[PDB]
Homo-oligomer: 439 residues x 4
């Protein structure tokens, strides 16, 4: 008979998961833009002599510079309601860093016993972090200027305070304004004891609801999420039933025999995985929007992976035809040899990664970590960022000519061996499968 | 018999459309250079503390900074005839922003009822933009300093004024100088209420003729445009006649039968489209040069598309030969399979675009919008801007290691799957067509 | 018999031309480094508020700024022997810009009759450049401060002076120090009348010999040049004799018949061209080193082209073998089809270049000129600088969404059509020739 | 019989060499980070008006600037214990630059007899460097301000001093803190006599042990190194025995005959080389960690090359199979033709390198040296950094249009000839070997 009803379900599933992902992405982009702009404004307000683009190189180098930076941060905290453009409120902290009735916590962190005398080549140190904090309470509209840093024993200096604001961007998109609480941490890190103390500002936003959100004249999203859950549960149920029928037929055919073992439809397995991921992501999204969960990364990862998986199934629909079927069977045929060559080239690639790390870590910016070395080599294989690597090595040709020559040999050998042979063999293998399927 | 007369016409057509496009492009480049330099000078004159390259990051962060920026803009407007190098004239506005007899309009835009009290987690807002403007009239050779911004309710602040200048570059190329009117808008945008207010300056130029343009000792372009119109109308007429003959023969052959359906020459269809586009663009160009139409984008698009289409027809001329014919028939044969594989790879590409957007929007500069994600993935497929993507993800490895691992898996899977398989299959398909045509 | 004597000659020829090119390149690099450092020092000395990297954006925007820049340049010229680190001497000019007994010439250039009144939309201009110059003579160890610029009629302002120095770098490489004369031009260009006046400094060095160059204890190069000339003249003579024998045999074989027409050895033609280029370049080099000719570009081009041509002949030596011969005959076979496809793809490429120029000139930095458009498209075809193009177009998505959509369609169509089809067909054609030669 | 014991040994060898390389790399990265941060802090402390990123363009241009830079460096040296954040100790030098009891050495270096009079075009110079030094001793908590530079005869000015510090980062990783001695050299180089004097700061660190390193409560690395040495000596012994057996069988089979000559296993040769490299690197590492050898480059190169070689042997393990064996035999077959084509393309590549150097050295940043030209051409071949080259040439189109046209022809010819033909032939050759192995 005729029954395309099951095929109909999965297209509506693709449609609804795509719309849900688009809506969630738009909302999340708005919230992330708000957070990022608030953080940039915080850096410009609280970091003395800060300019855009100077984030990793922003550091202090003199005792006077460090004192001025700390004092400027505290004074700008005290003058925020007068100078700021953002309508921020104090919190009168009651947590761990802040005592009962203080907004800002200025804390040193230094060794308990530290005596460094480089001139006698002697020292005695007891590694144990002693923390002394000064508490500052904001006026509603004193001794932090007497701070002594103990530079020889210093490990880091941190400033902790929180700010409450109302997100007014949500007036657009017809959302109810959200109550944000930004936890701001300014770190003066001296863990390297190298004379250079980096200064960074990091924020953590805690979104909550507002007690009295009355907005003049102001469930579709929740009902759409419920609809997505329903459609994905129906898809899960039908795929599970189909797998049960498949296993029943597998036992019935095995009872006659008296990759051949498997007789399961992988498309249904992929559909089941996508349905489970979508249901989990939708529940997580309902929670996040209800403001009882923040957890933004996991939900986004689940929803994106599910959307990708459901968009893979259009290949399953295309296999029902013939020319598309042969075009996909060519890749299916070519895959095993591609993996077998991947192993043989991956052992060489790993050896080159280790050698490049161990040799060019001290002298090359792109070779500092193993993951960075892997990314650099992968981009080199595909023809990207080659002259920058060569010029970075060339900028140190006068010093360690041995290292420069080794870098030349290393880079030339790697690029030649991989680009001119490995990729050519990949192309050769896949053309072979194309010919096999046309024969 | 011998009659290459029709073939002769299209080569002269290609020649004339190419010359016309070159002339129009030269003139438009001159005008665009003038506009751009005027806008850059305006930014340097009116934006306080502005430097080249700081266009997207240029913003205010304190109330004093905003006040100084606004006051500096107004004062530089008032001192323009004394300080400027560009011989600008005032307009004494009479439009919508400006009252009868005012040159500069300084306007706030804020909510009618706005009360934000983040410290009680309460607020009441009536979303409706109230606009109060201060009018400034230029001396011919007062209370704008009393402006209060209402920062909590503020949405944006804008400055509107117009400037009249004479384009003296047209003395070169033997053109009569043009009368330019630049409408200048300086926007202080606080729509995000994030404490950071971007400052931008945009200009809109209205070109008109000058009442008494007497230039010492001072129709070729118009006559050349007329000639182009004539040649393209002749080409249109001959192509239409040829299509009529083709349809007549199609009916005559159909009356004997008693992709087979189509018997039309696609080259003639392309020629007809190019002729129509050229005639429309030439009329639009005559208007633009007569100064009764500005509309620069549409005319340029029409002329460029027509020029590209007429340059395609040289392929038609090359098909008349044999080796060129087989080289073009190879591509003709390879096209259908290329489109069929394009669909199968495009579904995966769309799924990866959606997943990349939804996951890496919050953390990656190149993944903010769907079009940007598509461009990033397309450049990744072709081997461009790979290490920058990897390093942008690496700059956030310490925070959200789950997101970093997902980004690694996502990027590696995408690049491997597309570069190593999809492009290889494209090459394999086109080599197959080459072999088929040589057999 | 055995006679490899002629083959021996060309290897010594390759050796000597390579050594000569290396020596000339080293000397020219030294001289160019000296000139460039002198020019950079001149910019830092004479351009007010100049910083490294601000060369194209360095401009004046106010009348006070222009006055200060001009006055600072003149004062720094007057204080050069006191402030400079470079031991420069004055010239007391006697040329065209400078009157008899003046070192610095400050010259305006403005229209003879210029009246611009933008506010009445009227003007009368007589295009004719009137030049008034102020002459400044340097003290040996007055009214330039009264300069009035006539800003409305101004076209450009230029400062001309010359400086004499002694090149002491040539003490290294055991050369006799050279007497340099730098002609310095500082241009304040107002040809666009846009309110922005670019400021640039250009130098032209005239190298001469020093009258009394006595250096303590201080012909190989000249003799080596003579040797190169001798070897290239012998090679020319033998190649000409071989061509004469070839033509004699061509007539003798034609007298029996009673690409077949040509029976000449192309390697000998290439050798003759290389010999002529080397002799011309060597004479030019002897002149340049004798200091009677500067003309550095022509000699370098001749020598480099000759060196490349002589390094091509190693292919001729490799053809004498068999496997190298088949590897070169594969390319020889593949060339004609490669050119025939080049024409078919070049017509499309030209059409796309014209369309891209005409549409994206006003809005894209990389599309301003036709040559720039061609370079951009060529780099796009090979997989370079794609995301930068896409992001440059994206930075203007809010304005002219029609232009943004057209740019998206244009870029995607071009990249797909060329990268996925044209390059694939190139690879397909060359694999075909490989197969033909192996069969 | 069954004896996989020898095969077992090499996997444990790969494991131990990989772990040893990882540990050594981590330690070396920590030490290099400490050195780099100390050097950056030194530049910020001692270079007047120094900013991050201005390393190659940092230079002096006036006599007052040079005096201020030198005096600021000396004064910052004198005020270091008061202003610095790094707990540095003086050394009271007793070496060659420093007299007995001086910490800082300020030394000019100028010609013995130097008279440059550019205005008479005469000069007399005796090239011989005279050095006069001023010794400064640090107070323990005078006439350097009277320094005269002799600018006309000046060659360079250098400042020498040393600083002792204690590395406290080693408290992490449970290492005993190290005693560092940084030798700091500040060079004011006037070797070009061009009016621009570059200023650079270089450091050389001498690591030693600390006399009394008492750290509260504080051999695995040494024992692991010993274990690696033992395993690599066993591997060397077995490989040598196997080679002895191979040679014995070679003589026994040669005594019957009465690439055929060689009958040796190349894998064993590679293993022997890797074992020797690992033993040498491990002894060198033991020395370096014992602090009696610094020599960091040689040990890292040896260890990295050995690790790469041992990771190649997994290919040997994969050859024991069949599909991996054919995938590796395809590359083995394709290699000879790849080398033969490499020679033919390398002669052209060398000719293009020479021509590009000789012509575009004066005008292109990427063409200054032969190695830089080679890297630029290699990156161009692989599709990287093409538009930057084209734009660098375009930035000088107005001057030397002949050079611009030559650069256009050169770049287009090179890119077309190599990318469109050489790489296509490489792909064609390797596909041929794939077909041969499948047949």
């Amino acid at each position: 008979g005729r029954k395309p009803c099951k095929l109909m379900l999965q297209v509506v599933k693709i449609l609804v998961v795509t719309v849900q992902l688009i809506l969630f992405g738009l909302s999340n982009q708005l919230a992330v833009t708000f957070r990022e702009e608030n953080t940039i404004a915080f850096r410009h307000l609280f970091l003395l002599g800060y300019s855009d683009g100077a984030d990793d190189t922003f550091a202090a180098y003199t005792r006077e510079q460090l004192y001025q930076a700390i004092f400027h941060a505290v004074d700008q905290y005290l003058a925020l309601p007068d100078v700021s453009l953002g309508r921020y409120a104090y919190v009168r902290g009651g947590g761990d860093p802040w005592t009962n009735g203080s907004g800002l916590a200025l804390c040193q962190r230094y060794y308990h016993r530290g005596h460094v005398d480089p001139a006698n080549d002697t020292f005695d140190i007891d590694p144990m972090v002693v923390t002394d904090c000064i508490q500052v309470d904001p006026p509603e509209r004193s001794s932090y200027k007497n701070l002594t840093l103990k530079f020889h024993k210093l490990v880091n200096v941190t400033i902790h305070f929180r700010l409450k604001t109302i997100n007014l961007q949500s007036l657009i998109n017809n959302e109810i304004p959200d109550c944000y609480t930004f936890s701001v941490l300014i770190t003066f890190d001296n863990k390297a004891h190298s004379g250079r103390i980096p200064i960074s500002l990091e924020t953590q936003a805690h979104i909550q609801e507002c007690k009295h959100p009355s907005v003049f004249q102001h469930s579709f999203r929740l009902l759409f999420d419920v609809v997505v859950i329903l459609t994905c549960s129906l898809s899960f149920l039908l795929c599970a039933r189909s797998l049960l029928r498949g296993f029943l037929l597998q036992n019935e055919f095995v009872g006659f025999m008296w990759e051949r073992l498997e007789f399961v439809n992988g498309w249904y397995i992929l559909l089941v995985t996508s349905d489970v991921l979508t249901i989990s992501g939708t529940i997580m999204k309902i929670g996040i929007e209800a403001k009882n969960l923040a957890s933004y990364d996991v939900c986004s990862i689940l929803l994106g992976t599910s959307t990708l998986l459901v968009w893979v199934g259009v290949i399953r629909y295309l296999t029902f035809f013939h020319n598309y079927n042969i075009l996909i069977a060519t890749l299916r045929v070519a895959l095993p040899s591609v993996m077998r060559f991947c192993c043989c080239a991956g052992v060489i690639y790993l050896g080159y990664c280790f050698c490049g790390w161990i040799v060019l870590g001290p002298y090359h910016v792109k070779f500092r970590s193993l993951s960075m070395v892997s990314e650099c080599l992968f981009s080199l294989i595909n023809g990207d960022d080659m002259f920058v690597t060569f010029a970075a090595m060339q900028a140190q040709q006068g010093r360690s000519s041995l290292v420069w020559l080794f870098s030349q040999l290393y880079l030339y050998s790697f690029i030649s061996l991989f680009i001119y042979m490995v990729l050519s063999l990949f192309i050769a293998l896949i053309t072979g499968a194309y010919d096999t399927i046309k024969h």
